[PDB]
Amino acid sequence: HFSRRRIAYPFYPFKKLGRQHPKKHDTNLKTAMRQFLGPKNYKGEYVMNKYFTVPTNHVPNYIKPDLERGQSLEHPVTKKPLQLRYDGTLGPPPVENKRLQNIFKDRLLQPFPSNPHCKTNYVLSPQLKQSIFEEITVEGLSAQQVSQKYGLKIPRVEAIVKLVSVENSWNRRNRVSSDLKTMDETLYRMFPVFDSDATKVIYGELVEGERSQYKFTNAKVGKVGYRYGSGNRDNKKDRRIGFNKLGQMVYI
Amino acid sequence: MTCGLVRIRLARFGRKNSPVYNIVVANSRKARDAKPIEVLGTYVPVPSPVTKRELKRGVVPIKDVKLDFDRTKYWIGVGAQPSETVTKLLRKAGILNDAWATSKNS
Amino acid sequence: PRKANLLKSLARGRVRTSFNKYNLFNLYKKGGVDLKSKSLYQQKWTAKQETRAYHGEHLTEKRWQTVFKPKLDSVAQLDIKETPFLLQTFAVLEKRLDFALFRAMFASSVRQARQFILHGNVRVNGVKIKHPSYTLKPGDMFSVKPDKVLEALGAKKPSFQEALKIDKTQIVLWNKYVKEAKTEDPIKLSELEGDEPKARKLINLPWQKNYVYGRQDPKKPFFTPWKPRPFLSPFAILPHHLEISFKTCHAVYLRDPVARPGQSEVISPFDVPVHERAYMYYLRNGK
Amino acid sequence: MGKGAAKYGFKSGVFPTTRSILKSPTTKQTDIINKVKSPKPKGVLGIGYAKGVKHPKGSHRLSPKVNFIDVDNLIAKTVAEPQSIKSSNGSAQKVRLQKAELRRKFLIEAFRKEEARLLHKHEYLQKRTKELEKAKELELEKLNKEKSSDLTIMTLDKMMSQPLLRNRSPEESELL
Amino acid sequence: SAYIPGEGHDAQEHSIVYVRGGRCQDLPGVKYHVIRGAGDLSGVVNRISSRSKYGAKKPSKS
Amino acid sequence: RYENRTIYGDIDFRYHGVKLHLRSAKPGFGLRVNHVIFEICECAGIKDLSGKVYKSRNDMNIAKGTIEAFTKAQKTLDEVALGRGKKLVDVRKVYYS
RNA sequence: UAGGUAGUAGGUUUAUUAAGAGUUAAACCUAGCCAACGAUCCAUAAUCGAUAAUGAAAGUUAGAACGAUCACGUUGACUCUGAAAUAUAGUCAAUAUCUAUAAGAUACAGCAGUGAGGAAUAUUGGACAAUGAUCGAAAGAUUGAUCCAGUUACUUAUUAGGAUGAUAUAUAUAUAUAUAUAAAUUGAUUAAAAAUAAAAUCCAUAAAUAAUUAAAAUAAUGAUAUUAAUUACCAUAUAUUUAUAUGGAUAUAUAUAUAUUUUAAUAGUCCUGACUAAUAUUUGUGCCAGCAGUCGCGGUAACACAAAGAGGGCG
């Protein structure tokens, strides 16, 4: 009782099951999700579900079955709300779900339908990325000042520098698969857009006819090479698993 | 070819494949890995691999050596016997005359 | 190591780091982790039994209990609301490459992210890192093979029979459209199954240029014309500490997750108290 | 991890200490001379001895002065320049002689470098401690200056100003 | 003094066994238990669960 | 409450037999105290405390004891100041973590 | 274990000693010295760290492993040697085995390995290629140090496959696909599931196959070693991870217009009255039979025994 913790039956009320066919052999948790879903289509997907396909206008479409109780089968073309009727014919509701009509403004950027502290960061605009790539390779006014000048965080703008340059390289090489040539457009429209106002080692010797493959490093006795002891915590469960420059997990 | 009362050897602390040698100065009686008189540095057997493109170019993988050039002096002078490798290292690093050559097949 | 009472189990009311609809059902078919009739232990346990299933599902308990770091990073960088501090409990996972790959949405699940890394599809700073255990560091760009990203952000190629069924039903609908137009040609079956091009050429529609739906490109083993993967927006969370470039299928580890007044870089679908109970449990080494 | 290691920045690692090539205080410290020679305080401190107590004869009554090695003087006493010129007419012999003087020159440098280490130890650190003397007086520099609110504490000055205990005057006791 | 666990034993005077730790709570004397699975002691039959503690190899099937 | 999260200063109120010894902790240190003190702290607001109960951990008494500590041995900063005739200060914000 | 101590306590003067001292040896004085803040005596134990474990910290434990110190090489003593050894030597004795009778030889606490003891701990391996060590002017000789592999889940670590999916039929851009034909397992009579669980689809890689070939080391020499990796017809270098272009490799029908080896998947184990996460029930038994850290549980519907379903742990 004080703990119990059983099946995760939908928190919201959902049409249950009764006097099942002896062969029906069915489950409630299945019918529930089944209603969160809509009569499967030939194509095999679900022509209708509050959020079946994908958004297309910078406004994200995060699950809000909280505000809308549970009914979540809007029309594909008329974007018109429906609900399941006694016999089993999809049809409109007699009461506006409320709130879902005037969804709290910012709330739209609240991915999880619980944590009120996780918010999707609006995508960056093409112009920002374009203008930003040029600013560096033109004068590169202090990224620190330019980031302040452009809101974006200091390591934010600098990250774009590498991305845009790589994007440009890809554009020149046209590597960008016809897929990305479109897919990206859908991502650009699943989230919003920001920027709206608001003397080192020993080797000085002749490196020709000799070479310092056996390169070195100067140091001072006392604080230098390996130590006698350092119980190799290799039989313990916190070993130092460094990664080879080549690309291989390698022990410290 | 480099043995005497005071010597400079390579302590073994590296694992398999890459047993990083440790340029250490120890007495002849003292064992190689036995706490040496002083640790000049560590000489990796495998040259630290450089960028594969750099490897294709003039750049060559270079072993990382912690050898303390100024420190060996106190020993070279007093009179230690650096391992042939260390001997060569000193010769190549300019620590001592290249003529410290032992005229081996090298 | 990937089954239990089911990872995508409507009965197992636990969210996973995935984009699957059985996992999605549990995203919406769930209220706050029940914590009003439980004692400290049961309160801690419910949290763990729930946070882990999403925050570090693949990793083992022994590993996590060693990976979890008591001290957390929450100093709100240049940014009054209260900083969700204990929401950075599983920040170490967000730091990990495999977890961050799901955050970059270049893999359907963190498990698929691990596989993509294992395949060598994941390359960090141009280095083909095949270790999902690797922990990404500030300024570490992590890129996944575009085809793998397409697989993660696109539907899978249907069986040739399924493609024919979709077309033949659509062809019947097309015939109905023509018949309805009259009021206002069916293709074969076994013959179509004989050869994919034969069926593709025979099944031609205004949109179908002599191809079959889902198998428009036989060479591609992904649905064609790359039907975008569904149930993506429900889990479409893009971290500010993780740069993401779907266009180039590239991502960059900008910085370690940093909590801010009413904001946490950690993508946590669990409440701060839920994270708190789990965090408290791990603080005493899962006691 | 050893709680000891932890104290020394966790990662520590015990290492045989590298003794400086200079083995003893040098003659290049003519103040160290009197520093380790000038009269000892034979008083409360055991340093020194008791004048009345006759020390056991055959024993240095006071602490023996540590010998001050002359770096340059010894340098050659240890390794002086060969007497003949190229007495050798054999190459290997000349190479061994050169390899040789080469090893002496490093010892010559080591002694001088170690002396320089001792020199700055009683020179650079000394003039760097001078800045400590002046830098410390800065602790009370900003503090001693009258702070806006100092009248509050300075309110019972009379109590300390008044003689708390004046005992009794000579005649004042006499009458008693 | 030991205690034999499981429902079925092969206690034959002069057998050799492997003694383990544990109280018998009821038997006010047996402060040491024995292992149903070593020496001459056996493994309960059809023992379907907790087999290890009670000695038994995955009852295999055809 | 101090900074609306933890107690003002380390306390040691002894209620009947229970000897509670709660200590204020840095912002972040979660709720680390006896189950009961946790639920009181959960409802009071304290979200950063730490302590221990010695002689007699009388569950209920711990609860009466805890709220008694919060009201008896937790003088706010103002009081300390007005009373002593001075003004104590807060330095953590003067740094803006 | 309450009194201990007579070279003991100190003093002086000799012997020897690199050398001070009852340190020995010697000689002679004096009466001390230690002790209930534990003497003397007995028992146990190799010691320790910047090593390992546990905790909040003080600490607490260990002593395998890393490394430092000691001490011993069957026992005892002594002796020579020798800077330094009561030397894993020698000497004589002691204990126990052999050449088969020596004023003999051996003593595995060097590496393998055997028997024993024990709950319990490995190959009668390969190489001197590396790093050292001894001999030698050098040539290079030796090296069970050492480096390598073998056995052993003892430890750590990493991997151990995703995506998608609750039937199957027959008819008839989009969009409310639309009827019908049925069937349709394990529970179950509804908030009682098992169950996306299986299944086909689907997608890869591990491996399998060519190709390959780094680096430990070079002057050469690599024991390991089926090398590690890379690696997919190739070079050729392109260009940017990448690409096109060239020839050869290989290409059919009748030289080129392209192909360009193949490819999987699989967990147990403990618990489910409370402590302590584990509600879908049911069954058998009958204070027996068993379980049980602790509370206890078993005599007529046992959540605690023994099971089934269902489930929760660790992996």
Swiss-Prot record, chain A:
Pfam families for the chain: Bot1p
Principal subcellular localisation of the protein: mitochondrion
Compartment(s) where it occurs, according to its Swiss-Prot or TrEMBL record: Mitochondrion
A GO CC annotation given for this chain: mitochondrion
Protein origin, superkingdom: Eukaryota
Keyword Lyase: no
Subunit details: Component of the mitochondrial small ribosomal subunit (mt-SSU). Mature yeast 74S mitochondrial ribosomes consist of a small (37S) and a large (54S) subunit. The 37S small subunit contains a 15S ribosomal RNA (15S mt-rRNA) and 34 different proteins. The 54S large subunit contains a 21S rRNA (21S mt-rRNA) and 46 different proteins.
Remarks, miscellaneous: Present with 3460 molecules/cell in log phase SD medium.
Protein name: Small ribosomal subunit protein mS45
UniProt organism field: Saccharomyces cerevisiae (strain ATCC 204508 / S288c) (Baker's yeast)
Gene name per UniProt: MRPS35
UniProtKB/Swiss-Prot annotation, chain C:
Localisation: Mitochondrion
Job description of the protein: Component of the mitochondrial ribosome (mitoribosome), a dedicated translation machinery responsible for the synthesis of mitochondrial genome-encoded proteins, including at least some of the essential transmembrane subunits of the mitochondrial respiratory chain. The mitoribosomes are attached to the mitochondrial inner membrane and translation products are cotranslationally integrated into the membrane.
Outcome (variant: residue 103 to K): In MNA6-1; causes temperature-dependent loss of the 15S rRNA
Pfam families assigned: S4
Entries under InterPro entries matching the protein: Ribosomal_uS4, Ribosomal_uS4_CS, S4_RNA-bd, S4_RNA-bd_sf
GO MF term set: rRNA binding; structural constituent of ribosome
Protein name: Small ribosomal subunit protein uS4m
GO biological process, one term: mitochondrial translation
Family as reported in the entry's similarity comment: Belongs to the universal ribosomal protein uS4 family.
Key words of the record: Mitochondrion, Ribonucleoprotein, Ribosomal protein, RNA-binding, rRNA-binding
Limits of the S4 RNA-binding domain: 95-164
Further remarks about this protein from its record: Present with 3270 molecules/cell in log phase SD medium.
Domain of life (superkingdom): Eukaryota
Lineage: Eukaryota, Fungi, Dikarya, Ascomycota, Saccharomycotina
Broad class of where this protein is predominantly found: mitochondrion
A GO CC term attached to the entry: mitochondrial inner membrane
PROSITE patterns on file: RIBOSOMAL_S4, S4
Reported effect, residue 239 to L: In MNA6-2; causes temperature-dependent loss of the 15S rRNA
Swiss-Prot record, chain E:
Protein location: Mitochondrion
Purpose of the protein: Component of the mitochondrial ribosome (mitoribosome), a dedicated translation machinery responsible for the synthesis of mitochondrial genome-encoded proteins, including at least some of the essential transmembrane subunits of the mitochondrial respiratory chain. The mitoribosomes are attached to the mitochondrial inner membrane and translation products are cotranslationally integrated into the membrane. uS12m is required for respiratory growth.
Subunit annotation: Component of the mitochondrial small ribosomal subunit (mt-SSU). Mature yeast 74S mitochondrial ribosomes consist of a small (37S) and a large (54S) subunit. The 37S small subunit contains a 15S ribosomal RNA (15S mt-rRNA) and 34 different proteins. The 54S large subunit contains a 21S rRNA (21S mt-rRNA) and 46 different proteins. uS12m forms part of the decoding center of the mt-SSU.
Family to which the UniProt record says this protein belongs: Belongs to the universal ribosomal protein uS12 family.
Further comment: Present with 238 molecules/cell in log phase SD medium.
Protein name from the UniProt record: Small ribosomal subunit protein uS12m
Native source organism of the sequence: Saccharomyces cerevisiae (strain ATCC 204508 / S288c)
Gene: MRPS12
Residues of the whole record sequence present: 92 to 153 of 153
UniProtKB/Swiss-Prot annotation, chain F:
Major site of localization recorded for this protein: mitochondrion
Note: Present with 6680 molecules/cell in log phase SD medium.
Keyword tags: Mitochondrion, Ribonucleoprotein, Ribosomal protein, Transit peptide
Subcellular location: Mitochondrion
Quaternary structure and partners: Component of the mitochondrial small ribosomal subunit (mt-SSU). Mature yeast 74S mitochondrial ribosomes consist of a small (37S) and a large (54S) subunit. The 37S small subunit contains a 15S ribosomal RNA (15S mt-rRNA) and 34 different proteins. The 54S large subunit contains a 21S rRNA (21S mt-rRNA) and 46 different proteins. uS3m, uS4m and uS5m form the narrow entry site of the mRNA channel.
Positions spanned in the full protein: 210 to 306 of 307
Protein name as annotated: Small ribosomal subunit protein uS5m
Leader sequence segment: none
Protein's organism: Saccharomyces cerevisiae (strain ATCC 204508 / S288c)
Entry keyword NADP: no
Keyword Mitochondrion appears in the UniProt entry: yes
